[PDB]
Structures are given as C-alpha cells and as structure tokens.
C-alpha cells in the first residue's frame, strides 16, 4: 500500500482492467479463427495476437 504497487493497480483498473500476455493469449484463443489466429501467434508471438 505504502509502496505504490497497490495504487498502480488501482489506476490501472480504472481504464483497461484485464491485460493478456501474448502467448497466454495465443494458446487460449487460437481456436477462434483458428487458421488466421494460429498463424499470427506462431509467426510473431506478439504480431500473432494482433
């Protein structure tokens, strides 16, 4: 609390709450447009999710 850590979380949560890490994003959702999302995730760990 006194760190600022809890205040940084606050300010975060006011905003864009949930924030997904890219691989953690690939794996779980590739299946949605399976062909085009898998290619993206594999082809660039980040560029993929994009």
């Amino acid at each position: 609390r006194c760190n600022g850590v809890l205040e940084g979380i606050r300010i975060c949560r006011k905003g864009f709450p949930s924030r997904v890490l890219y691989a953690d994003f690939k794996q779980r959702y590739r299946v949605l447009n399976a062909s085009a999302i898998p290619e993206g995730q594999f082809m660039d760990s980040k560029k993929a999710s994009e």
Binding site: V31, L32, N33, A34, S35, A36, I37
Partner: protein
C-alpha cells in the same frame, strides 16, 4: 397463402430421395434456403429443439410440418439488409476501396461463428477473387445476393 405457391411442394419432391413425400429434419435447413429463406443454422436448430424435436435421432417428414416451418421462417427475411453486409466488410479492411485479403475472408468464414467448411468457402470465392489476393466485396456481395 397460395398466393398459394404449389412449387414448394414440387421442390419437396426434388429433395426427397425416397419418393415417399417426406423430408428428413436434417434437410429442412438447406431446403428453406433453396425456397428463398435464409434462417441461420442456430435458429433452425433452436426452433427444432424448441418444439421437442431431436435432429440427433432418425427423422421423417411430412409436408404438413415443413410448410408451417417455412412459414415461420419467412417472417425473419426482414433481417437480410445489404447495407450491413457491405459495411461489415468495409470495417474489415483499411483504405477507401472494398478489398479483403484472400485468407482473411477464408479463415473468418470457416472459423468465426457458424463454421463454414473450407470447401464451401473456396466455392464462394472462386471467380470473384483474382490472383492479386484481393477480393472486391462490392461485386462479391452483389453476386452472393444474386442467388
């Protein structure tokens, strides 16, 4: 109503492979589309189940159930607005010209929502997409609404 369109009964004789004048419940989705109705497959699925009708076990039909199911699907044809179809694909690609990159439309039509096979996706792009890899959806949606 008849306007009694008796050609719906003549088209049921073209889709019944046994000639007994019954059409299975698995054919009713595609035959409503062939009579000039586009109900989504989840809608065709719901209605069926809604009426405690299981498409999982053997099914038969009679014209006396298929006629009122086509008349219950015929009110939903007011959902077929072409402004929203062309504006959907206009938000799908940048710049002021209606072109989807080939593989974007093919992977979205196979994996997003109601799964269309990649065989049917290739049969719907065949002729409208040339070797530049860019599908002009102004003429593509025009030809899709020509059938």
């Amino acid at each position: 109503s008849k306007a009694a369109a008796d050609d719906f009964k003549e088209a049921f004789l073209l889709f019944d492979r046994t000639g007994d004048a019954k059409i299975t419940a698995s054919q009713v989705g595609d035959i409503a589309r062939a009579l000039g109705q586009n109900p989504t497959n989840a809608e065709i699925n719901k209605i069926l189940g809604n009426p405690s009708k299981e498409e999982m076990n053997a099914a038969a039909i009679t014209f006396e159930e298929f006629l009122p199911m086509l008349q219950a699907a015929a009110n939903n044809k007011d959902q077929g607005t072409f402004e929203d179809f062309v504006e959907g694909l206009r938000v799908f690609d940048k710049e002021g010209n209606g072109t989807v990159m080939g593989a974007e439309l093919r992977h979205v039509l196979a994996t997003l929502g109601e799964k269309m096979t990649e065989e049917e996706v290739e049969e719907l792009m065949k002729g409208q997409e040339d070797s530049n890899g860019c599908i002009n959806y102004e003429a593509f949606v025009k030809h899709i609404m020509s059938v």
